[PDB]
Paper text:
In the structure of cN-IIIB in complex with 3,4-diF-Bn7GMP (5d), each moiety of the inhibitor is stabilized by direct contact with various protein residues. The 3,4-difluorobenzyl group of the modified base is accommodated in a hydrophobic cavity formed by sidechains of Trp105, Trp106, Tyr 60, Ala109, Leu63, Leu77, Leu113, and Ile159. Then, the guanine base intercalates between the off-centered π-ring system of Tyr 60 and Trp105 separated by typical stacking distances of 3.6 Å between the side chains and the base. The hydroxyl group of Tyr 60 is additionally engaged in interacting with the ribose ring, which adopts O-4’-endo conformation. Tyr 60 forms a hydrogen bond with the O4’ atom, while the 2’- and 3’-oxygens of the ribose are hydrogen bonded with the carboxylic group of highly conserved Glu 88. The phosphate group is placed in a binding cavity in the vicinity of amine group of Lys205 and amide group of Ala157, which are in direct contact with phosphate oxygens. Additional hydrogen bonds via structural water molecule with hydroxyl residue of Ser156 and hydrogen bond of Tyr60 with 5’-O-oxygen support the stabilizing contact of phosphate group with nucleotidase and simultaneously distance it from the catalytic center by 2.7 Å. The observed shift of the phosphate center away from the catalytic site may explain why the compound does not undergo dephosphorylation despite tight binding to the protein. The differences between solved structures: the holoenzyme of cN-IIIB • Mg2+, and the enzyme in complex with inhibitors: 5d or 5d’, concern mainly two helices of the CAP domain, which move slightly down and left towards HAD domain by about 3 Å. Comparisons CAP of domains revealed that human cN-IIIB stays in a more open conformation than the domain of Drosophila cN-IIIB. All the above suggest that ligand 5d freezes the protein conformation in an open state of the enzyme.
5’-Cytosolic nucleotidase IIIB (cN-IIIB) is one of the most recently discovered 5’-nucleotidases and has several unique structural and functional features. However, one of the most preferred cN-IIIB substrates is m7GMP, for which the activity of dephosphorylation is characterized by one order of magnitude lower KM constant compared to the other preferred substrates, whereas kcat/KM is comparable. The crystal structure of cN-IIIB consists of two distinct domains: the globular core domain (residues 1–51, 132–182, and 215–300) and the smaller CAP domain (52–131 and 183–214). The core domain is a haloacid dehalogenase domain (HAD).
Author numbering: 4 to 210, 219 to 292
Write the structure that this text describes.
Amino acid sequence: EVSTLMKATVLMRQPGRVQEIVGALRKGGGDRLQVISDFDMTLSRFAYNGKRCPSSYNILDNSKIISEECRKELTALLHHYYPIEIDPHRTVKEKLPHMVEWWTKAHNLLCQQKIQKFQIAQVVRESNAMLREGYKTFFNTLYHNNIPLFIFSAGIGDILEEIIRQMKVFHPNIHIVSNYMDFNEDGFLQGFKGQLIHTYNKNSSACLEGKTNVILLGDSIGDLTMADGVPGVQNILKIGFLNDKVEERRERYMDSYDIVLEKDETLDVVNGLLQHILCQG
Ligand SMILES: Nc1nc2c(c(=O)[nH]1)[n+](Cc1ccc(F)c(F)c1)cn2[C@@H]1O[C@H](COP(=O)(O)O)[C@@H](O)[C@H]1O
Ligand SMILES: [Mg+2]
């Protein structure tokens, strides 16, 4: 019996199956647990006080480090490629090369600007970034219980890192899997480290001591693949935030996610399950 799953925001297509998965995670305990979470609109809020909260892309796109001309080119890239991303009549494989182009073109553009490492903190300090209510309990509980948290984003990892750092919850159990800026010795942006992470490879292959049990947190249908690449996953619980277009997407989300949290700007349910799992061996 999990009290937290009775919150008004909770939707479960198969509650009996959910209680089976939760009971399996309970028996594994913290020793076998890892959390794999998207960032934008999952750990960060969708809206606050009737106003939409920015994505990590918005924080960069509206920032003062980006010039007028560069912002115009980034906008033209979006008007070109975003309709491809959301085209209902194309398969993933018919969107994949264009998303790779979109990301490569945007990164190449950022590298033509004179971005310096210290400017990222300034961009975040002035932004309206907000984490979901209960983030202190979420990050603090994972850290004190030695639970690895992998945060996935196809955006800029330095931006995510500075948001969490400035909220005083960047504990060493946090591992951000994203596109990190590559700075030269002078501190100027010259490229991006590692392999490109775009919207279709935001999964664990971009990244363990018996971490067979997974809690997955996301807000998009694409986020369901984030744990793909984790070897020997014995149990997985997928929790999805349904923030927008609720009537159109509710049945889809309930079919795909084990637990759906509808218009819930808190981590209350995730924190309750975490406490339930960790407290029972
Ligand atoms: N607002 C905004 N959104 C973008 C942009 C953008 O320019 N502006 N771009 C292009 C871009 C790529 C790399 C950059 F460094 C950059 F500055 C711009 C991608 N997206 C979104 O990224 C989500 C997947 O990533 P996530 O899984 O992490 O949410 C997808 O739904 C995309 O619509
Ligand atoms: Mg997201």
